[PDB]
């Protein structure tokens, strides 16, 4: 037996930006899906495409674990078929997998302001893509000036803000089931 490293994915000290999330291929292991189901340390925990309770006794070829940080009210944009700043710029309607989001004020928001999303893009992001801005006729040559600006506003996170204005860490469980050999079930 060789347990899957879901502990170090959910318990990673520092995550990445929403525009630069880290896809994490997890395979060749055994996943105890009951840990995620019965932790109670998760603000939001929902999905479709697979039975959440009976997901334990099913295996797939590989497991993909997205990981990024968004605001409290922006957790709605991490669902299939959603419109928003994060959804359209930073999951397909046939997504089979679960999205797990929890509160991370004490770890991403500091008293002085850690300040460690993408606001502008000509084309909306196609599913499972990740992008790492001309707003007029003026073809700016690389100077962030008139009608041209940086496409990245840094997040502002402090413990003083409200529930939906606070940082949230999101892990998306993306199960793929290609015709290869499945290797991850408990």
């Amino acid at each position: 037996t060789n347990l899957c490293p879901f502990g170090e994915v959910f318990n990673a000290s520092k995550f990445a930006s929403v525009y630069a999330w880290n896809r994490k291929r997890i395979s060749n292991c055994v996943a105890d899906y009951s840990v995620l189901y019965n932790s109670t340390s998760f603000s939001t925990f929902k999905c479709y495409g697979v039975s959440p309770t009976k997901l334990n006794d099913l295996c797939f070829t590989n497991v993909y674990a997205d990981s990024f940080v968004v605001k409290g009210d922006e957790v709605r944009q991490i669902a299939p078929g959603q419109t928003g700043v994060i959804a359209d710029y930073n999951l397909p309607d046939d997504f089979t997998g679960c999205v797990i989001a929890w509160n991370s004020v004490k770890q991403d928001a500091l008293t002085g302001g850690n300040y460690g999303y993408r606001l502008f893009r000509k084309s909306k992001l196609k599913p499972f893509e990740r992008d790492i801005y001309q707003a007029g006729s003026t073809p700016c040559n690389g100077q962030v000036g008139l009608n041209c600006y940086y496409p990245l506003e840094r997040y502002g996170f402090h413990p003083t803000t409200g529930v939906n204005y606070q940082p949230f860490r999101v892990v998306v469980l993306s199960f793929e089931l290609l015709n290869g050999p499945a290797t991850v079930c408990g």
Epitope: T1, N2, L3, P5, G7, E8, V9, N11, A12, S13, K14, K24, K106, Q107, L110
Partner: antibody
Framework: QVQLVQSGAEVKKPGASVKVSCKAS????????ISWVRQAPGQGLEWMGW????????NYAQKFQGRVTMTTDTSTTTGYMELRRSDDTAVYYC????????????????????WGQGTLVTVSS | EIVLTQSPGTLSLSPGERATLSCRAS???????LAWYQQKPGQAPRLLIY???SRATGIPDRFSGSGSGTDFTLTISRLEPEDFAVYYC????????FGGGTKVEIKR
């Protein structure tokens, strides 16, 4: 209820190396890493290194870059530690690591838990 | 490196008093990569706090840790007879660094 047990006290001269075993039982041995801390008598804790029980990668401290060697056996759930002086006379501790991750290698939310009893190593001519 | 400077080196409080042990870093350590360790004399180190605020399983409630940025503090709300030991702070933001220790002595 996991316990880590180390080897008995072994003394040497300021020549060759001493080796300490550390067998754990109670957790998946390849799920959590192992760390080593050195504490001289009358002194505090001094970190030595870190090892991954899944991939085998080692992150030794800056002091022991070129002296210490760490290996673990996946079968016996045992982690080994070897330091290739009288200055190093101390008690070597073995602990379960939750700060660097066993599979990937990223910093985690945790510390060192379930320490061993500590192997007494004295080096004197 | 990031150096953890603890002060005072030796603390003296009678049983029942409130203890406020502090750990200071030479740089800015992430609020997650900092752990407190208690070591009773003649025994092994015991994990108290991880993430600078979260206690390890089995640790009592009187051991509450806090801090952020460069200044961090471990607080023992009600000192108990077994709480008199040597305490350390450890950060793994940049490699790994321990502290000099803070012995908690019985005042008489």
């Amino acid at each position: 209820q996991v316990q880590l047990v180390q080897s008995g006290a072994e003394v040497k001269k300021p020549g060759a190396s001493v080796k300490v075993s550390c067998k754990a039982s109670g957790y998946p041995f390849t799920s959590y890493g192992i760390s080593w801390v050195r504490q001289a008598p009358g002194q505090g804790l001094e970190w030595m290194g870190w090892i991954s029980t899944y991939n085998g990668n080692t992150n030794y401290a800056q002091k022991f870059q070129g002296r210490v060697t760490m290996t673990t056996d996946t079968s016996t759930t045992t982690g080994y530690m070897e330091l290739r002086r009288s200055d190093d006379t101390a008690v070597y501790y073995c602990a379960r690591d939750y700060t660097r991750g066993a599979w990937f290698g990223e910093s985690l939310i945790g510390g060192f838990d379930n320490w061993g009893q500590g192997t007494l190593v004295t080096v004197s001519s | 490196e990031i150096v953890l400077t603890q002060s005072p080196g030796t603390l003296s409080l009678s049983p029942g008093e409130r203890a406020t042990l502090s750990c200071r870093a030479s740089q800015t350590v992430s609020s997650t990569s900092l752990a407190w360790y208690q070591q009773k004399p003649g025994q092994a180190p015991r994990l108290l706090i991880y993430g600078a605020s979260s206690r390890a399983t089995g640790i009592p409630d009187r051991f509450s840790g806090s801090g952020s940025g460069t200044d961090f503090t471990l607080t023992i709300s009600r000192l108990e007879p077994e709480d008199f030991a040597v305490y350390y702070c450890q950060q793994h933001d940049t490699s790994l660094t321990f502290g000099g220790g803070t012995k908690v002595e019985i005042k008489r």
